[PDB]
């Protein structure tokens, strides 16, 4: 009953598209809030209402809310100012410094933080998923409910799963598992983006050819401007053991101290 949202509270304004997924799309609507809105243009009904009372239930300053649920189903989604943190970092308007970057690397651990905490793996981890309000806090999105395919690009197919190989740890490209240490790999990719501003990871690899490419000895390389203990960090969340990668409460409390190095 918390979860629901009665259908005379939301108007969702079709005109004005936020962004085009696979299976839905995202518009701006109006809850007086600001929000966002996911249409699902299907899956087992209890499995959907069940999920949202999981997310409804999570809170934390770094992780992306669910609004609630208007009964196909709308998912309803806090309107996020500033977008991605990959598009964000990419424009040639914004100026975060490397202090900036490295602290939006420490929200999204601490997001990461929460998530695992709940036992919940996030799965597709990225910059482009993760979005900021409006006073620029990072929160870990698309997940849940909220979880689709916007930027087709980074998705490879093959069981025909389109998946994200290029943030995947070698045991998911291998398995097609998930768990807490493959979000522990591709925070370390995300920690890549953020300090290259948003470049694409492996350029000169295709797709699957990426286990072999990584099975040759090779990591992504250090940034001119990340912080050698920074690139540590990044290595260690690319252990080729799972269970020797670190946790993300290990992640929050590594980068806070390199963070704290900085001024400005
Ligand atoms: C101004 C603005 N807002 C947004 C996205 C946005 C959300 C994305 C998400 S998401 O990361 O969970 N998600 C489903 C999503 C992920 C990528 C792209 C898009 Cl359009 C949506 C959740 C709430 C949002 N509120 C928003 O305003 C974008 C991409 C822009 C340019």
């Given at each position: 009953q918390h979860v629901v949202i009665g259908p005379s509270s939301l108007i969702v304004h079709?005109?004005?598209?936020?962004g085009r997924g696979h299976f839905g799309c995202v518009y701006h609507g109006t809850l007086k809030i600001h929000c966002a809105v996911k249409s699902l243009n299907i899956g087992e009904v209890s499995q959907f209402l069940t999920e949202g009372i999981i997310m409804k239930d999570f809170s934390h300053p770094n992780v992306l809310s669910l609004l609630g649920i208007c009964l196909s189903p709308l998912v309803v989604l806090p309107y996020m100012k500033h977008g991605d943190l990959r598009n964000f970092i990419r424009n040639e308007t914004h100026n975060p410094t490397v202090k900036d970057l490295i602290g939006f690397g420490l929200q999204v651990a601490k997001g990461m933080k929460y998530l695992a905490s709940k036992k919940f793996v996030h799965r597709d981890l990225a910059a482009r998923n993760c979005m900021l309000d409006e006073k620029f806090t990072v929160k870990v999105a698309?997940?849940?409910?909220?979880?689709?395919?916007?930027?087709?690009?980074?998705y490879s197919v093959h069981t025909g799963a389109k998946l994200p190989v290029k943030w995947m740890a070698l045991e998911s490209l291998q398995t097609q598992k998930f768990t807490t240490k493959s979000d522990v790999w591709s925070f370390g990719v995300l920690l890549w983006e953020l300090m290259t501003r948003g470049a694409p990871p492996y350029p000169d690899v295709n797709t699957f050819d990426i286990t072999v490419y990584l099975l040759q000895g090779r990591r992504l390389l250090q940034p001119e401007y990340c912080p050698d203990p920074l690139y540590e960090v990044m290595l260690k969340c690319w252990?080729?053991?799972?269970?020797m990668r670190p946790s993300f409460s290990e992640l929050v409390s590594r980068i806070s101290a390199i963070f704290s190095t900085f001024i400005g």
């Open positions: 079709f005109n004005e598209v936020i698309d997940f849940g409910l909220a979880r689709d395919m916007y930027d087709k690009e980074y252990h080729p053991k799972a269970e």
